[PDB]
Coordinates of C-alpha atoms in Angstrom, one line a residue:
Chain A
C8 CA -2.8 -13.3 -22.5
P9 CA -1.0 -14.7 -19.4
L10 CA 0.5 -11.3 -18.6
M11 CA -2.0 -8.6 -17.6
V12 CA -1.3 -5.2 -16.1
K13 CA -4.0 -3.1 -14.2
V14 CA -3.4 0.4 -13.0
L15 CA -5.6 2.4 -10.6
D16 CA -5.6 6.1 -9.5
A17 CA -5.8 6.4 -5.7
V18 CA -6.6 10.2 -5.8
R19 CA -9.7 9.7 -7.9
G20 CA -10.8 6.2 -7.0
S21 CA -10.8 5.1 -10.7
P22 CA -8.9 3.1 -13.2
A23 CA -5.9 5.0 -14.6
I24 CA -6.7 5.3 -18.3
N25 CA -4.3 5.9 -21.3
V26 CA -1.2 5.0 -19.2
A27 CA 1.7 3.8 -21.4
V28 CA 3.2 0.4 -20.4
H29 CA 6.3 -1.1 -21.8
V30 CA 7.3 -4.8 -21.1
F31 CA 10.9 -6.1 -21.6
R32 CA 12.5 -9.5 -21.2
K33 CA 16.2 -9.9 -20.1
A34 CA 18.2 -11.3 -23.0
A35 CA 21.2 -13.6 -23.0
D36 CA 23.6 -10.7 -23.2
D37 CA 22.1 -9.0 -20.0
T38 CA 20.3 -6.3 -21.9
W39 CA 16.5 -5.6 -21.9
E40 CA 14.8 -6.7 -25.0
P41 CA 11.4 -5.2 -26.0
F42 CA 8.6 -7.7 -25.3
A43 CA 5.2 -5.8 -25.5
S44 CA 3.7 -2.4 -24.9
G45 CA 0.5 -0.6 -25.0
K46 CA -1.8 1.8 -23.3
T47 CA -4.3 1.0 -20.5
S48 CA -7.9 0.9 -21.5
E49 CA -10.9 2.6 -19.8
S50 CA -10.8 -0.2 -17.2
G51 CA -7.2 0.6 -16.5
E52 CA -6.2 -2.8 -18.1
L53 CA -3.3 -3.2 -20.6
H54 CA -4.2 -4.4 -24.1
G55 CA -1.8 -7.4 -24.5
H56 CA -1.8 -9.7 -27.4
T57 CA 1.0 -11.9 -25.8
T58 CA 0.7 -15.7 -26.3
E59 CA 1.5 -18.5 -23.9
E60 CA 4.1 -19.7 -26.4
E61 CA 6.2 -16.6 -26.6
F62 CA 5.9 -15.9 -22.8
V63 CA 8.8 -18.2 -21.9
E64 CA 10.7 -18.4 -18.6
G65 CA 12.9 -15.4 -17.9
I66 CA 13.2 -12.1 -16.1
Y67 CA 10.6 -9.5 -17.1
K68 CA 10.3 -5.8 -16.6
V69 CA 7.0 -3.9 -16.6
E70 CA 7.5 -0.1 -16.9
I71 CA 4.5 2.1 -16.2
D72 CA 4.7 5.7 -17.4
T73 CA 3.3 7.2 -14.2
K74 CA 4.9 10.7 -14.7
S75 CA 3.1 11.4 -18.0
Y76 CA -0.2 10.2 -16.4
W77 CA 0.0 12.7 -13.5
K78 CA 1.4 15.5 -15.8
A79 CA -1.6 15.2 -18.1
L80 CA -3.8 15.8 -15.0
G81 CA -1.8 18.9 -14.0
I82 CA 0.1 17.3 -11.2
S83 CA 3.9 17.1 -10.9
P84 CA 4.6 13.7 -9.4
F85 CA 7.6 12.4 -7.5
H86 CA 8.5 9.2 -9.5
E87 CA 9.7 9.1 -13.2
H88 CA 7.8 5.8 -13.7
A89 CA 6.9 2.6 -11.8
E90 CA 9.0 -0.4 -12.6
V91 CA 8.2 -4.0 -11.7
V92 CA 10.9 -6.6 -12.3
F93 CA 10.2 -10.4 -11.7
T94 CA 11.1 -13.9 -12.8
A95 CA 8.3 -15.6 -14.7
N96 CA 7.4 -19.2 -15.5
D97 CA 10.4 -20.6 -13.7
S98 CA 8.4 -23.6 -12.6
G99 CA 6.0 -23.9 -15.5
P100 CA 3.5 -21.5 -17.2
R101 CA 1.6 -19.2 -15.0
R102 CA -0.8 -16.3 -15.5
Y103 CA 0.4 -13.1 -13.9
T104 CA -1.7 -10.0 -13.0
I105 CA 0.6 -7.0 -12.1
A106 CA -1.6 -4.3 -10.3
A107 CA -0.3 -0.8 -9.7
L108 CA -2.0 1.7 -7.4
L109 CA -0.9 5.3 -8.1
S110 CA -0.7 8.4 -6.0
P111 CA 1.5 11.6 -6.8
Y112 CA 4.2 10.7 -4.2
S113 CA 3.5 7.0 -3.7
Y114 CA 2.7 3.8 -5.5
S115 CA 2.1 0.2 -4.5
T116 CA 2.4 -2.8 -6.8
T117 CA 1.1 -6.3 -6.2
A118 CA 1.2 -9.5 -8.2
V119 CA -1.4 -12.3 -8.3
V120 CA 0.0 -15.5 -9.8
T121 CA -2.4 -18.3 -10.8
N122 CA -1.8 -21.8 -12.2
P123 CA -4.5 -22.3 -14.8
Chain B
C21 CA 22.0 13.7 4.7
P22 CA 19.5 14.9 2.1
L23 CA 18.7 11.3 1.0
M24 CA 17.5 8.7 3.4
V25 CA 16.0 5.2 2.7
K26 CA 13.8 3.4 5.2
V27 CA 12.5 -0.2 4.6
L28 CA 9.8 -1.9 6.6
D29 CA 8.7 -5.6 6.6
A30 CA 4.9 -6.1 6.4
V31 CA 5.1 -9.8 7.3
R32 CA 7.0 -9.5 10.6
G33 CA 5.8 -6.0 11.6
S34 CA 9.3 -4.7 11.8
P35 CA 12.1 -2.7 10.1
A36 CA 13.8 -4.6 7.3
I37 CA 17.3 -5.1 8.6
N38 CA 20.5 -5.8 6.5
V39 CA 18.8 -5.1 3.2
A40 CA 21.2 -4.0 0.4
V41 CA 20.4 -0.7 -1.1
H42 CA 22.1 1.0 -4.1
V43 CA 21.5 4.6 -5.2
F44 CA 22.5 5.8 -8.7
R45 CA 22.6 9.2 -10.4
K46 CA 21.6 9.3 -14.1
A47 CA 24.6 10.4 -16.2
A48 CA 24.3 12.7 -19.3
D49 CA 24.7 9.6 -21.4
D50 CA 21.5 8.1 -19.8
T51 CA 23.7 5.6 -17.8
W52 CA 23.4 4.8 -14.1
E53 CA 26.5 5.9 -12.2
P54 CA 26.8 4.6 -8.6
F55 CA 26.1 7.3 -6.0
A56 CA 25.7 5.6 -2.6
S57 CA 25.2 2.1 -1.2
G58 CA 24.9 0.1 2.0
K59 CA 22.9 -2.3 4.1
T60 CA 20.0 -1.1 6.2
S61 CA 20.5 -0.8 10.0
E62 CA 18.5 -2.3 12.8
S63 CA 16.1 0.6 12.4
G64 CA 15.6 -0.2 8.7
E65 CA 17.5 2.9 7.6
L66 CA 20.3 3.3 5.2
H67 CA 23.1 5.6 6.5
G68 CA 23.4 8.0 3.5
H69 CA 26.7 9.7 4.1
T70 CA 26.4 11.9 1.1
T71 CA 26.5 15.7 1.5
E72 CA 24.1 18.4 0.2
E73 CA 26.7 19.6 -2.3
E74 CA 27.2 16.3 -4.1
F75 CA 23.4 15.7 -4.1
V76 CA 22.7 17.9 -7.1
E77 CA 19.4 18.0 -9.2
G78 CA 19.0 15.0 -11.4
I79 CA 17.3 11.7 -11.8
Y80 CA 18.2 9.2 -9.0
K81 CA 17.5 5.5 -8.8
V82 CA 17.1 3.6 -5.5
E83 CA 17.4 -0.1 -5.8
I84 CA 16.4 -2.3 -2.9
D85 CA 17.5 -5.9 -2.8
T86 CA 14.2 -7.3 -1.7
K87 CA 14.8 -10.8 -3.2
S88 CA 17.8 -11.5 -0.9
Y89 CA 15.9 -10.2 2.1
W90 CA 13.0 -12.7 1.6
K91 CA 15.3 -15.6 0.8
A92 CA 17.2 -15.0 4.1
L93 CA 13.8 -15.3 5.9
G94 CA 12.9 -18.4 4.0
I95 CA 9.9 -17.0 2.1
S96 CA 9.5 -17.1 -1.7
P97 CA 9.4 -13.6 -3.1
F98 CA 7.9 -12.4 -6.4
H99 CA 10.2 -9.4 -7.3
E100 CA 13.8 -9.4 -8.4
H101 CA 14.2 -6.1 -6.4
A102 CA 12.4 -2.9 -5.7
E103 CA 13.4 0.1 -7.9
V104 CA 12.4 3.7 -7.2
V105 CA 13.3 6.3 -9.8
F106 CA 12.7 10.0 -9.1
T107 CA 13.9 13.5 -9.9
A108 CA 15.5 15.3 -6.9
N109 CA 15.9 18.9 -5.9
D110 CA 14.0 20.5 -8.7
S111 CA 12.7 23.5 -6.9
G112 CA 15.8 23.2 -4.6
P113 CA 17.4 20.9 -2.0
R114 CA 15.0 19.2 0.4
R115 CA 15.5 16.2 2.6
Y116 CA 14.1 13.1 1.0
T117 CA 13.1 9.9 2.8
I118 CA 12.3 7.1 0.4
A119 CA 10.2 4.7 2.5
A120 CA 9.4 1.2 1.2
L121 CA 7.1 -1.3 2.8
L122 CA 7.8 -4.9 1.7
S123 CA 5.7 -8.0 1.3
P124 CA 6.7 -11.2 -0.6
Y125 CA 4.3 -10.4 -3.5
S126 CA 3.7 -6.7 -3.0
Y127 CA 5.6 -3.5 -2.2
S128 CA 4.7 0.1 -1.8
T129 CA 7.0 3.1 -1.8
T130 CA 6.4 6.7 -0.8
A131 CA 8.6 9.8 -0.6
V132 CA 8.4 12.0 2.5
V133 CA 9.9 15.3 1.1
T134 CA 10.5 18.0 3.7
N135 CA 11.9 21.5 3.3
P136 CA 14.6 22.6 5.9
Chain C
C19 CA 5.4 5.7 25.2
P20 CA 4.5 2.1 24.1
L21 CA 2.0 3.3 21.5
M22 CA 2.8 5.7 18.8
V23 CA 0.8 6.7 15.7
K24 CA 2.4 8.1 12.5
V25 CA 0.5 9.3 9.5
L26 CA 1.8 10.2 6.1
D27 CA 0.2 11.9 3.1
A28 CA 0.7 10.1 -0.3
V29 CA -0.5 13.0 -2.4
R30 CA 1.8 15.7 -1.0
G31 CA 4.8 13.5 -0.1
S32 CA 4.8 14.6 3.5
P33 CA 3.7 13.9 7.1
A34 CA 0.0 14.3 7.7
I35 CA -0.2 17.2 10.1
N36 CA -3.0 18.2 12.5
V37 CA -4.9 15.0 12.0
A38 CA -7.2 13.9 14.8
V39 CA -6.5 10.5 16.3
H40 CA -8.5 8.6 18.9
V41 CA -7.3 5.5 20.6
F42 CA -9.7 3.2 22.6
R43 CA -9.4 0.1 24.8
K44 CA -12.1 -2.5 24.5
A45 CA -14.0 -2.9 27.8
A46 CA -15.2 -6.3 29.2
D47 CA -18.7 -5.4 28.0
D48 CA -17.4 -5.1 24.4
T49 CA -17.6 -1.3 24.5
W50 CA -14.9 1.2 23.4
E51 CA -13.6 3.2 26.3
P52 CA -11.5 6.2 25.3
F53 CA -7.8 5.7 26.0
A54 CA -5.8 8.5 24.3
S55 CA -6.3 11.2 21.7
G56 CA -4.7 14.1 20.0
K57 CA -3.7 15.8 16.8
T58 CA -0.7 14.8 14.8
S59 CA 2.4 17.0 15.0
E60 CA 4.4 18.6 12.2
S61 CA 6.2 15.2 11.9
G62 CA 2.9 13.3 11.5
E63 CA 3.2 11.8 15.0
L64 CA 0.7 11.6 17.8
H65 CA 2.3 12.3 21.2
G66 CA 1.0 9.3 23.1
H67 CA 1.5 10.3 26.8
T68 CA 0.3 7.0 28.1
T69 CA 2.6 4.9 30.3
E70 CA 3.6 1.2 30.1
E71 CA 1.6 0.4 33.2
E72 CA -1.8 1.7 31.8
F73 CA -1.0 0.1 28.4
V74 CA -2.2 -3.4 29.5
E75 CA -3.0 -6.3 27.1
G76 CA -6.3 -5.9 25.3
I77 CA -7.8 -5.0 22.1
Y78 CA -7.1 -1.4 21.1
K79 CA -8.7 0.7 18.3
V80 CA -7.0 3.6 16.6
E81 CA -9.3 5.9 14.7
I82 CA -7.8 8.4 12.3
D83 CA -9.9 11.3 11.1
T84 CA -8.9 11.1 7.5
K85 CA -12.1 12.8 6.2
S86 CA -11.4 16.1 8.0
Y87 CA -7.8 16.0 6.8
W88 CA -8.7 15.7 3.1
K89 CA -11.5 18.3 3.4
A90 CA -9.0 20.8 4.9
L91 CA -6.8 20.2 1.8
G92 CA -9.8 20.6 -0.5
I93 CA -9.8 17.1 -1.9
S94 CA -12.8 14.8 -1.9
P95 CA -12.1 11.7 0.2
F96 CA -13.7 8.3 0.1
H97 CA -13.5 7.0 3.7
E98 CA -15.3 8.3 6.8
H99 CA -12.1 7.6 8.8
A100 CA -9.3 5.0 9.0
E101 CA -9.8 2.5 11.8
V102 CA -7.1 0.1 13.0
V103 CA -8.1 -2.6 15.5
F104 CA -5.4 -4.8 17.0
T105 CA -4.5 -6.8 20.1
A106 CA -1.6 -5.4 22.1
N107 CA 1.1 -6.9 24.5
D108 CA 0.1 -10.5 24.1
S109 CA 3.5 -12.0 24.6
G110 CA 4.4 -8.9 26.7
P111 CA 4.9 -5.1 26.3
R112 CA 6.5 -3.9 23.1
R113 CA 6.7 -0.5 21.5
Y114 CA 4.0 -0.2 18.8
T115 CA 4.1 2.2 16.0
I116 CA 0.9 2.3 14.0
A117 CA 1.8 3.8 10.6
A118 CA -0.8 4.9 8.2
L119 CA -0.3 6.2 4.6
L120 CA -3.2 8.2 3.3
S121 CA -4.6 8.8 -0.1
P122 CA -8.1 10.1 -0.9
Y123 CA -9.4 6.8 -2.1
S124 CA -6.9 4.4 -0.5
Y125 CA -5.0 3.9 2.7
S126 CA -2.6 1.4 4.1
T127 CA -1.6 0.7 7.7
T128 CA 1.3 -1.3 9.1
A129 CA 2.4 -2.0 12.6
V130 CA 6.1 -1.7 13.4
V131 CA 6.4 -3.7 16.7
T132 CA 9.8 -3.6 18.4
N133 CA 10.9 -5.3 21.6
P134 CA 12.9 -3.1 24.1
Chain D
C15 CA -24.5 -6.0 -7.3
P16 CA -23.2 -2.4 -7.0
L17 CA -21.1 -3.4 -4.0
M18 CA -18.2 -5.8 -4.6
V19 CA -15.4 -6.7 -2.2
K20 CA -12.2 -8.3 -3.4
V21 CA -9.5 -9.5 -1.0
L22 CA -5.9 -10.5 -1.9
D23 CA -3.1 -12.2 0.0
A24 CA 0.3 -10.3 -0.4
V25 CA 2.3 -13.3 1.1
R26 CA 1.2 -15.8 -1.4
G27 CA 0.3 -13.6 -4.4
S28 CA -3.2 -15.0 -4.6
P29 CA -6.8 -14.2 -3.9
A30 CA -7.7 -14.6 -0.2
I31 CA -10.3 -17.3 -0.3
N32 CA -13.0 -18.2 2.3
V33 CA -12.6 -14.8 4.1
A34 CA -15.8 -13.7 6.1
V35 CA -17.1 -10.3 5.2
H36 CA -19.9 -8.4 7.0
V37 CA -21.5 -5.3 5.6
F38 CA -23.5 -2.8 7.8
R39 CA -25.4 0.4 7.1
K40 CA -25.6 3.2 9.8
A41 CA -29.2 3.5 10.9
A42 CA -31.3 6.5 12.0
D43 CA -30.5 5.8 15.7
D44 CA -26.7 5.8 15.1
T45 CA -26.3 2.0 15.4
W46 CA -24.9 -0.3 12.7
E47 CA -27.6 -2.4 11.0
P48 CA -26.7 -5.7 9.3
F49 CA -26.8 -5.2 5.5
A50 CA -25.0 -8.2 3.8
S51 CA -22.4 -10.9 4.6
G52 CA -20.7 -13.7 2.9
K53 CA -17.4 -15.5 2.3
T54 CA -15.0 -14.7 -0.5
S55 CA -14.9 -17.1 -3.4
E56 CA -11.9 -18.8 -5.1
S57 CA -11.3 -15.5 -6.9
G58 CA -11.2 -13.6 -3.6
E59 CA -14.5 -11.9 -4.5
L60 CA -17.5 -11.5 -2.2
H61 CA -20.8 -13.2 -3.2
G62 CA -23.3 -10.3 -2.9
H63 CA -26.9 -10.5 -3.9
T64 CA -27.5 -6.8 -3.1
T65 CA -29.8 -4.9 -5.4
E66 CA -29.5 -1.3 -6.7
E67 CA -32.8 -0.6 -5.0
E68 CA -31.9 -1.6 -1.4
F69 CA -28.4 0.0 -1.7
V70 CA -29.6 3.4 -0.7
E71 CA -27.5 6.5 0.3
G72 CA -25.9 6.2 3.7
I73 CA -22.8 5.3 5.6
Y74 CA -21.6 1.7 5.1
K75 CA -19.1 -0.4 6.9
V76 CA -17.4 -3.4 5.4
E77 CA -15.7 -5.6 8.0
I78 CA -13.2 -8.2 6.7
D79 CA -12.3 -11.0 9.1
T80 CA -8.6 -11.0 8.4
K81 CA -7.6 -12.6 11.8
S82 CA -9.4 -15.9 11.1
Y83 CA -7.9 -15.9 7.6
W84 CA -4.3 -15.7 8.9
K85 CA -5.0 -18.1 11.8
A86 CA -6.2 -20.8 9.5
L87 CA -2.9 -20.6 7.7
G88 CA -1.0 -20.9 11.0
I89 CA -0.1 -17.2 11.3
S90 CA -0.9 -15.0 14.3
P91 CA -1.6 -11.6 12.7
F92 CA -1.5 -8.1 14.1
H93 CA -5.1 -6.8 13.3
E94 CA -8.4 -8.1 14.6
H95 CA -10.1 -7.4 11.2
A96 CA -9.9 -4.8 8.5
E97 CA -12.8 -2.2 8.5
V98 CA -13.7 0.1 5.7
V99 CA -16.3 2.9 6.5
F100 CA -17.6 5.2 3.7
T101 CA -20.6 7.2 2.5
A102 CA -22.2 5.7 -0.5
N103 CA -24.6 7.0 -3.2
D104 CA -24.6 10.5 -1.8
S105 CA -24.8 12.0 -5.3
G106 CA -26.7 9.2 -7.0
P107 CA -26.2 5.5 -7.5
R108 CA -22.6 4.3 -8.0
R109 CA -20.9 0.9 -8.2
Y110 CA -18.2 0.4 -5.6
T111 CA -15.4 -2.1 -5.6
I112 CA -13.6 -2.3 -2.2
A113 CA -10.2 -4.0 -2.6
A114 CA -8.2 -5.2 0.4
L115 CA -4.6 -6.4 0.2
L116 CA -3.6 -8.4 3.3
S117 CA -0.2 -9.1 5.0
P118 CA 0.2 -10.4 8.6
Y119 CA 1.2 -7.0 10.0
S120 CA -0.2 -4.7 7.3
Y121 CA -3.1 -4.1 5.0
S122 CA -4.1 -1.6 2.4
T123 CA -7.6 -0.9 1.2
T124 CA -8.6 0.9 -2.0
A125 CA -12.0 1.9 -3.5
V126 CA -12.9 2.2 -7.2
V127 CA -16.1 4.1 -7.7
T128 CA -17.8 4.0 -11.2
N129 CA -20.9 5.8 -12.5
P130 CA -22.6 3.1 -14.8

């Protein structure tokens, strides 16, 4: 799976488990088309069964449901979710790891792109 | 102004100047209505000329045109833009500063929420 | 003051107030001589009452007492403190802002370096 | 190896390879005693042959030679190095992953602590 998402909790110093993640790809008509979704595992990693074949060039959006994550822990956070929008595979197939680091009023997101 | 945006550049160690920023209010019909927009100043700040009265409770989106910023500096960026979505003024009007620190393959965002 | 420190709290969405900060100059004998110190203000800033003349080129260390800050808020922290080491004024006197954004298990630091 | 260090480059969106890392443990007399050192691999991960046995409770320091990393890529960075100081194993053995994300004028460091 050439698209991996990893989410960490900066308050607890742990993977952020059970976090809902939705992935969309921008379609010809400018709308977001559903692409993949899942929940993070005990390692904070998203369970993607995406193939290299269907992962074509385009603009992708990864939406991480951070608000429900914090709410379940009793915390009322600032952000509704964390969104990451990026062009993928514009110069050939790559493997992408989108990392998100979560705090109640702050998040950071980083991408590592490798050419296998 | 109850809603300020500040953008910093982690590569140059400076404010991010002349970056386009668009703010939207979510409308009843889950659609994003324009709310404020501009280019960041030499201090990396976006004016915000909105008043407390029009800045009612609701879900706001702040969209930062990070891709144009990096292209103008000649560095290849990962993200299409940086989008921050949050609920404002629940528990009453505060001053919000949305701060964003930019790198080509990473960004972080934090809210500094202060009660006057 | 050519050297300012600003500290933000990612959990509360606010400046980090009353945080101890110590600044040192490296001495010829690779030893850290005290240079400035204080507690951050309500805006999360450390006064810095040093003058341009005493703020000569050299390697400076900024030590932020993050562990006491988190203990005062009742949250278990990871780090003993946050230490930023940098060379200043090579290429001439600038204004330096060392900004630090704190979470219990994570911190980031950035320099906003501006030429007057 | 219950102590792992992973370093990423936020300019290139890649692991930071060949980065020197030194690890110290605070000794009885208050001085830093050398504990481990190495260079990051092609995955940005540090090659530690540390055992659970020798990794006792104490205060550890991880020093990452960020300046040499940037210099080798032609960039003159702000920081001399990135230091992470923390108490380990104070409540029993844990596995620690220290992650550092590097930009020329900024870095962030995060810890994930797991109980195996």
